[PDB]
Each structure stands twice: as structure tokens, then as C-alpha cells.
Amino acid sequence: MEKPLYTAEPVTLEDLQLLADLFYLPYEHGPKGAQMLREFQWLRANSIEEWRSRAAKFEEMCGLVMGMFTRLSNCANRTILYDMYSYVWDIKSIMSMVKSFVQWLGCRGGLAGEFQRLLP
Amino acid sequence: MEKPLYTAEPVTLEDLQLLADLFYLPYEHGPKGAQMLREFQWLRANSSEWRSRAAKFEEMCGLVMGMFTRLSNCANRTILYDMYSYVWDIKSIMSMVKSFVQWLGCRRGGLAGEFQRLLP
Amino acid sequence: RRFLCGVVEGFYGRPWVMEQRKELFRRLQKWELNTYLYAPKDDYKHRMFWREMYSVEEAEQLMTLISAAREYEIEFIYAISPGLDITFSNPKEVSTLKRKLDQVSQFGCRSFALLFDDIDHNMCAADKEVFSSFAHAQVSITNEIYQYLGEPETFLFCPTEYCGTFCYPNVSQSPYLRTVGEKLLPGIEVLWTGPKVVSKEIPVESIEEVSKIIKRAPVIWDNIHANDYDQKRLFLGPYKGRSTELIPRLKGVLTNPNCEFEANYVAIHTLATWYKSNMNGVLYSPQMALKLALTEWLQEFG
Amino acid sequence: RRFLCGVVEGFYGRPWVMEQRKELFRRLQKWELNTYLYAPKDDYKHRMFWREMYSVEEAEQLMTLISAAREYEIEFIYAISPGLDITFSNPKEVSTLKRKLDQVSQFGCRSFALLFDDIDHNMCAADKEVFSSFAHAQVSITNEIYQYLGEPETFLFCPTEYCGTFCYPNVSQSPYLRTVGEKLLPGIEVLWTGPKVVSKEIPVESIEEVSKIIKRAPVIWDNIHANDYDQKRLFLGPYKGRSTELIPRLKGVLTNPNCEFEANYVAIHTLATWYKSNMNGVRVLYSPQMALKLALTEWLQEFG
Ligand SMILES: CC(=O)N[C@H]1/C(=N/OC(=O)Nc2ccccc2)O[C@H](CO)[C@@H](O)[C@@H]1O
Ligand SMILES: CC(=O)N[C@H]1/C(=N/OC(=O)Nc2ccccc2)O[C@H](CO)[C@@H](O)[C@@H]1O
């Protein structure tokens, strides 16, 4: 058996729909992202069998944010990706930490990041 | 008597020295940077001498703004544009940090940041 | 009826390039939008160094650009922001402003805009002597340029008090807006940003209030998708907060979008879906419009 | 002696334009640096879709860049990252790489590199059959491509266990680095990113430890000033944490710097200053705060 060739899976409509909700409006969050913040707050607030299943689908929800980047990172037209890489790379990373945090709950940003961490 | 024509104060070395201290190294804050951070942590705990430090903090905050102000107006827009994101974000975070210190004596960031905050 | 619907490139930061601007027109044409307002806050020869005449190559590019706007059935509006260091009473200044726009007319541009947004509310000792209030001085030179240019069909004017917040005592009682509405020629259009800079909502009564004092339907400068104020924030959401019931009460909607050009697809597409839905004075769903935009976009990725 | 000192465009994200690249060469030469490693993790032809040959304009642009590198007397090294989908056992694959590098050789490139960073330690069944270990696979292909190219002067190799915190089970006892140390050809220079991926300090001690197991002095791929991992951050600080005493114990230092090209002035200035300071010494000399004041000065004249 030889090594499977690297293949690019294309950006789906769901990928885009996820992205749109991740970076929505000034005075709003996209439902798909607003839900993802709801679920992470609740999952953090617990220690039933429900948590084990909700924390699972949240890790799937996280891998979706991660996969969305991979597929955007692999498409023929780079121009789209590069004009957003800053914003999309970061969400992918925080989401990657948030996935791992929840895995362990079952068993940065520079100086400006730090000052924004002190105000309420 | 007429409208004084538009003029651009050039970038000073003391500005660069401040910039480089703000965006220093991956494991170390710049002298000036870690200093600004120290005062904001302190002024937070106490709220009733204190006022003299707070005025010297707001003096330092202004220097960051001014630093951006001159960085923008310069002839080489090419340099500025590469780090527009960073400089714009540090000047902005300083403004809301300053306008908070003024409020204490007188008696944003997106979804990716909103996730970063609810982590240790 | 005439309605100016399109994009205003009026943000602070690295301005777009000819090939992006060209693709913007293709997109604008495809989505049945008509206008395009040139307002890049950076472009030296627009805000700070406005007086400066364009270079030989700068000229050729702008020409090629204005020509591409026509090819793509797009209304090209050229804006100039003197406001900063301009002396409203020195006729040399007024002449230099006149000379600047003459050069623009040479390239093929027919539609202009005099912008007075983000400037100190104070006139110098010379202008203080010559003109009554700050609105009087702006109106004087705006009308003079509207007339000097042979009263164009499309002539936009952005006031300094361009939103609700910025009005003192308030929109219905501001003596600045009063002078603008009264002394500004009805031919000259007025830009508005709604009740705030980045309006969350633009209620019909809010437009009715300003239309009343500006004594005309406003052209909306929409900062809803503007992102210059936080290069850490992207806006891939839909054109929400503006009722379709606004359309017969406005002369147009020019959306100031994200600095990042490629990121504006959804914001422009959804604006078009919004406008088209009720041109003829729940027809629009932001959540719905968004799926259309996202569907169409998905094709450009490949 | 020979010492490789420069920059490595080896980051993720929007790669530099060959316009910017020509400018970096001028800057490099001005500061007496001598190397450019072409390794942008994006460029489809470099990593992901590595087999794929360059087009007409793609070929044209690379030639001009290689030509500019000669003009500004900077050594151009072309790196290839075939590690994701390559089948080491398949000779057709080997031939595809041979063909890929020949095209670059036909642009004027004389210096090359083969990287195996950011890839899993598991081989496919065909590779599992043929080679005794993963280290054995990479050694065969690198050595084969080296010989094929005609044992060039500058041939770089990047291991999967390129940093202290990435060696299984540890640095000294790693079977992987031992296989490389022993079986990889002597002419081939090995890349090392220090104790961590982004090393706070690169201790002299740790360098003799790794030098031993790889049976040669490495070429540092310094990620100090890199900023892909946290796009919210930028690094304008001086080149800190690397003793001038490492200079005689290494074959070179290539800095992978901030993605935002213009921010790398202090980064590449302080690096040049660090190198020039203990250049000839064989076995203090460099002050970072002093190096930085010198950089910020030479930088300030770009603004105006
Ligand atoms: C007419 C108008 O809106 N003008 C400017 C304008 N001027 O005032 C500001 O810069 N205001 C502001 C910024 C962020 C949030 C609230 C107000 O609004 C936009 C803000 O992004 C700028 O891009 C425009 O150039
Ligand atoms: C040899 C090397 O360092 N390769 C890559 C590399 N590979 O491993 C990682 O991705 N490591 C990692 C990333 C951030 C922080 C800590 C470890 O590190 C750098 C990350 O900035 C990349 O720019 C390089 O392309």
C-alpha cells in the first residue's frame, strides 16, 4: 500500500455559512457562533450523561471551524483567503484551544490583548 | 489669520523606541510596555498621590496615540501598511484604557477574543 | 425615479487598487447596483494634499478606471475632502479647488462630491470675518463649485454633522443643518450615516427627522460593514437594521464596507438583494439574503 | 570558513512578493549577510502540491529572483517540502522530485534543501516494507537527491524532530536523529530550531548535545521573530537569547521572521550585528539593547 496523495477538499456552503456567523456584524454575532459561545459557557459551568454528549458535539463544532480554515487554505484562489487570513487564522487557533480545554474538562494577542483583558 | 496649512510632524527615534517596546519579543515585553501594564493593574485595585501617577499614565497613553499619528502621516505608507493592523490596534486599545483611568478619578476585539477571555 | 445604490470606498487605510475597483464594477453591474463613490481617506490628493494635481501616470490610471466604470454601467462619483487646511474666503483656495476638479472632468468624470466629514468645527480668523457660521462657509464654496461645474446631475455633499449623535442641540433643532437645508441648492444631495456613525438601525422616523431639516431625501453613507476602527474585526454578516420602507424616503444608499476588499462580497450582494426587493415606492430577510450571498460566493473559491 | 547567515522565508500565510524579495537581498547584502532560504509554507508548488512544475511566468519570476540573488551576492537556496504525500519506495516519485529540482536548477539555482517538518512520523505500508524506519526513508531520498544534483555545496535537510521539545524520546536517545547522524551524507547540512520550536534561548550546552547525536554542527532556523502562530502579535525586539559563542559551533543562522515584511528591519539588522560581532572567533561581544538602538536608527531613515 502506497501513501495516499494529498487532496484538497473544496470549501462547502456550510464552511462559508459557519464563517459568516463567526464574523457577523458590529452589534451582533452570527447564530452559529452565538450558539457556540452559549454552549462553551454552559459546558464550563458543569462537572449527568448529557455533558458527555454536548461536549462531544461541541468538539465536532470546533473541528468544523478548524476544517473550514483547512478547506479555505487549500482552494485554487488564494486572493480570497489571504485578504482574510489574519481574522480566520486566529478564530481557528482559539477554537483549537477551546476544543482541547473541553476534552480535559472531561478528565497571547500581544500587549493590546493583555490591556483588553483587564477592562470589564 | 488664514487657515494654517496641513503639516506632518515626522517620525522621531523616541517613537520607534516606544513602538519596538510595544511589539517587543515573543517571551518579553518592552521596558515601556511592561511599565504601562504595571500602572493599569495598580490603578484598578485602588479607587478613592494616586491621581499624580494616573495623570502620568494618561501622559504615556497619549504618546502611543501620537506615535501612531506621526507613523501614519509619514511619506512611507509602505512601512505603515504592513503594520497598520498592529499600530491601529494598539492606539485604539490605549484610548479606551486612557478614557477608563479618567472615569476612575472622576467621582470590541471580536468573537475570537470573546473565547480567549473565558479561559485561564 | 433615480436612486444612487452602490459602494462608497470611504474608509481610512490602504486604498483599493485599479484591478480590485474594476472587479467591484463587474460585481456592482451583475447585482443591478448603479453608483460608486471614490472617497479613499488615504489618497493624499483627496484629503490632506487635496490641492495637488494628479501625476501623468496617476491621470492615465484614473482615466482607464473612469472608462471602466462606464463600460460596466457604473456611475463614477469623484469626492474631494478639503475641510482640513482650506481657507473658505481666500479665492486662491476656491480657484485651486476649481482647478483640481477641472482635471478630473478631463479624465471623463461627470459626477462630483464635496466632503466635509471629520474636520474641526472651527473657521480661521479670515473665514470667521467673511462668513456667518461654519455651515455658511461650506455652503458658499459647495454651491460655487456646483455652479462652476455647470450644475451636475450628481453632486453630493457630506456635512460635518453627518449623523444624529454629532448634532447639537439635536437633528430637529441644529442651526448647522438648518443653514445646510436652507442655503444649499436643492440640486446638491446630502450624505447621512443615520442616527450614529456606524448606525445599528436606521428607523424611518430618524430619516423623516433629518429629511425635515435638510429639506430633502438623504443619500445614506452606510458604515454598517465599515471596519477601519478595528483591524481585528471582520463583517461577513448581512445588510440588517435598515427597513425596505426607507427606500422611497431616500435618494440612495452607498455602503462604506470593510477595508479588506475580498471580504465585502456578502455586504454588497445583500445590499443589492435589499434594494431590489422594494425599489418601486417583509420583502427582505437579512438571515435569508445571507444564504443567497453565500451561495453565489462559494463559486469564486474553486 | 563557510557560514550561512541570513533569512528563511519559511512561514505560513501570504508569502512575500518577488518585488519585496529583491529588496530583502539588497538589505541582506548591505548588512554583510549571505543567504536566502526559499521555503514559504504556502506556494502550492513548494509544499502541498510539490510535484507540480512552475508555469511560464512562475518560471520567469524565479529566474529573475535567482538572478537578483547573484547580483546582490546572496546565496539562494530552494527548499522543497514533499513530506505530506510522498511515497519514498516508489521510484516514479523520486523521479518527480528529481524533475522538480531540475527545473529550479534550470533557473540558476545551485543551492537546495529538503524539509520534513510539520509532518507525522508514520509511513505507508509500501514504505514500512522497504525502509526499517521513517528516519531511514528520509535519509535514502535526501542522500539520493543529493548525489543526483551532483553533491552541491549547499544542501540543507530539515528533520521531523527539528527541536528539543520534538525529539522522541529525547534529543540524545532519539533513534530518528541517530539514523540521520549516522547514515545521512556529511555534505548535507541539518536544520535545527533550538530547544523549542520558538526557542527563548539557544544554549551552547544544548547545541553540543544535538551536534553530537546528528554528528555535525547544525544550521539554526531561528523562529524568534516569527509571528504566524499569533497573527495578533508583531516582534520588533532585538535578536536576544543566542550567545555569540554559538557562532563557532554552528554552520549558520537563518531567521524565519514576522510575516509582515516591513517589520523585519530590527529583526534582520540585530541578527547581522550579532553575527558580525563574533564572526571570526573559533572555540560580552553583542548587546541587544545596543543592537536595537543601532537598528531603530538605521530604520528611522526609511520613514520620510
Ligand atoms: C461620513 C463618514 O462616516 N465618514 C468617516 C467616519 N468618520 O468618523 C469616524 O472615524 N467615526 C467612528 C469610528 C468607529 C466607530 C464610531 C465612530 O466614519 C467611518 C468610520 O469607520 C470612516 O471610515 C469615514 O471615513
Ligand atoms: C522548521 C520550522 O520551524 N518549521 C515550521 C514550524 N513548525 O512547527 C510549528 O508549527 N510549531 C509551533 C508553532 C507555534 C508555536 C510553537 C510551536 O514552526 C514555525 C511556526 O512559527 C513555522 O513558521 C515553520 O514553518
Coordinates of C-alpha atoms and ligand atoms in Angstrom, one line a residue, chain A residues 27, chain B residues 88, chain C residues 10-12 39 41 117-118 158-159 162 166 191-193 196-198 221 223 226-230 233 256, ligand 1:
Chain A
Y27 CA -23.8 44.9 17.1
Chain B
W88 CA -4.1 50.9 14.8
Chain C
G10 CA -14.6 56.0 2.0
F11 CA -12.5 54.1 4.7
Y12 CA -9.2 55.0 6.4
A39 CA -13.6 58.7 -1.2
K41 CA -9.3 58.7 3.1
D117 CA -16.7 64.8 7.4
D118 CA -14.2 64.5 10.3
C158 CA -21.3 65.3 3.2
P159 CA -21.8 67.7 6.2
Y162 CA -23.5 63.7 9.1
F166 CA -23.0 64.7 16.0
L191 CA -24.9 62.4 2.8
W192 CA -26.2 60.9 6.0
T193 CA -24.8 58.0 8.2
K196 CA -24.8 57.3 14.6
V197 CA -21.5 56.9 12.7
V198 CA -21.9 53.0 12.5
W221 CA -23.4 56.6 3.6
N223 CA -20.9 52.3 7.9
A226 CA -17.1 49.6 7.8
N227 CA -14.2 48.1 9.7
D228 CA -11.4 50.7 9.7
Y229 CA -12.0 51.4 13.5
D230 CA -10.8 47.7 14.5
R233 CA -12.9 42.8 13.4
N256 CA -18.8 52.0 3.2
Ligands
LIG1 C1 -19.2 60.2 6.6 C2 -18.4 59.2 7.4 O1 -18.9 58.2 8.0 N1 -17.0 59.5 7.4 C3 -16.0 58.8 8.1 C4 -16.2 58.4 9.5 N2 -15.8 59.2 10.5 O2 -15.8 59.2 11.9 C5 -15.2 58.1 12.5 O3 -14.0 57.7 12.1 N3 -16.1 57.5 13.4 C6 -16.2 56.3 14.2 C7 -15.4 55.2 14.1 C8 -15.8 54.0 14.7 C9 -17.0 53.9 15.5 C10 -17.8 55.1 15.7 C11 -17.4 56.3 15.1 O4 -16.8 57.1 9.7 C12 -16.2 56.0 9.1 C13 -15.7 55.2 10.4 O5 -15.2 54.0 10.1 C14 -15.0 56.4 8.3 O6 -14.4 55.4 7.5 C15 -15.4 57.5 7.3 O7 -14.4 57.9 6.5

